[PDB]
Paper text:
As hypothesized, no binding-associated MST signal was observed for G16C, lending support to stabilization by formation of a disulfide bridge between the two G16C GAL-7 protomers. As expected, the disulfide bridge between the G16C homodimers was found to be a significant contributor to dimer stability. CD melting curves show that G16C is the more stable variant (Tm = 70.0 ± 0.1 °C), followed by WT (Tm = 67.8 ± 0.2 °C) and G16S (Tm = 58.7 ± 0.2 °C). Conversely, the G16C variant has a greater capacity to induce apoptosis of Jurkat T cells than WT, yielding an EC50 of 5.9 μM (CI95% 5.2–6.7 μM). One of the most significant structural rearrangements between WT and G16X apo structures occurs in the local environment of residues 8–17 (loop 1), which exhibit significant atomic-scale deviations in the variants.
Among prototype galectins, galectin-7 (GAL-7) is recognized for its preferential expression profiles in normal epithelial cells. For example, while extracellular GAL-7 can trigger apoptosis of activated T cells following binding to glycoreceptors via its GBS, it can also bind E-cadherin on epithelial cells independently of its GBS. In this work, we studied the impact of homodimer interface mutations on the induction of Jurkat T cell apoptosis, allowing us to positively and negatively modulate the biological activity of GAL-7 by designing a covalent disulfide bridge (G16C) and destabilizing mutation (G16S) to control homodimer strength, stability, and biological activity.
Author numbering:
A (entry chain B): 4 to 135
B (entry chain A): 1 to 135
The structure:
């Protein structure tokens, strides 16, 4: 349940560096770009590695309802293995990088200038969260 | 050692491009460089010259256009040490290049040449290169 508050939002070319360890029997974890600390706040990005189902789900949340799910190729995560993730906020969308390779491109659905908070949750052991 | 390392970038880079350079500074290194150049041709213009200097304990940013070097900028201190590995991000944005070293933003180098003119990434000097990734 890590929260990084982002007053004045994030301007494009923002890099999110997420370093951590995947627990040995972890189910799934998530990184969300939300518009506020409130519960029903809109999710500009929902990045959801799911090891139980062996997938990685991208989505957004608007007006309390989830949008269409996108999925990337395979799972660049392993139970008991560390990981580094970049989330590059561009004009065209979000570039998710895992390890040394770009994993998926999630095109914008909500205005990027609405993101007010970064939340990291789930079965993840967080080492560091940096925003450049 | 992987120097001089060259990564050719036809069709350029669009903004919000992240350059990840990882390597080791050898035990008796003097200085090394990372250049965002406009072509493989000799004496090609340098949109960015990122120049860690361990012998003089400085880090110099500059650009080169039409064969002439611009004015040098300098960052705070040297986030590099002989005998220690390093990671550097060069975030090509709309306003310029954000140089991140380790866990901290180090310096912002405003554009002097059009960002869309960069055609090559070169890494040279007293550096033992681990990887150059472009996202």
């Amino acid at each position: 349940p890590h929260k990084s508050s982002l007053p004045e939002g994030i301007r494009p070319c923002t890099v999110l560096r997420i370093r951590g360890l995947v627990p040995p029997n972890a189910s799934r974890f998530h990184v969300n770009l939300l518009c506020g600390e409130e519960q029903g706040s809109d999710a500009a990005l929902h990045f959801n590695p799911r090891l139980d189902t062996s997938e990685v789900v991208f989505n957004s949340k608007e007006q309390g309802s989830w949008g269409r799910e996108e999925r990337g190729p395979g799972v660049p995560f392993q139970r008991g293995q560390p990981f580094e993730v970049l989330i590059i906020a561009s004009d065209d969308g979000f570039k998710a990088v895992v390890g040394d390779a770009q994993y998926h491109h999630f095109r914008h659905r909500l205005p990027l200038a609405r993101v007010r908070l970064v939340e990291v949750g789930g079965d993840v052991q967080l080492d560091s969260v940096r925003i450049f």
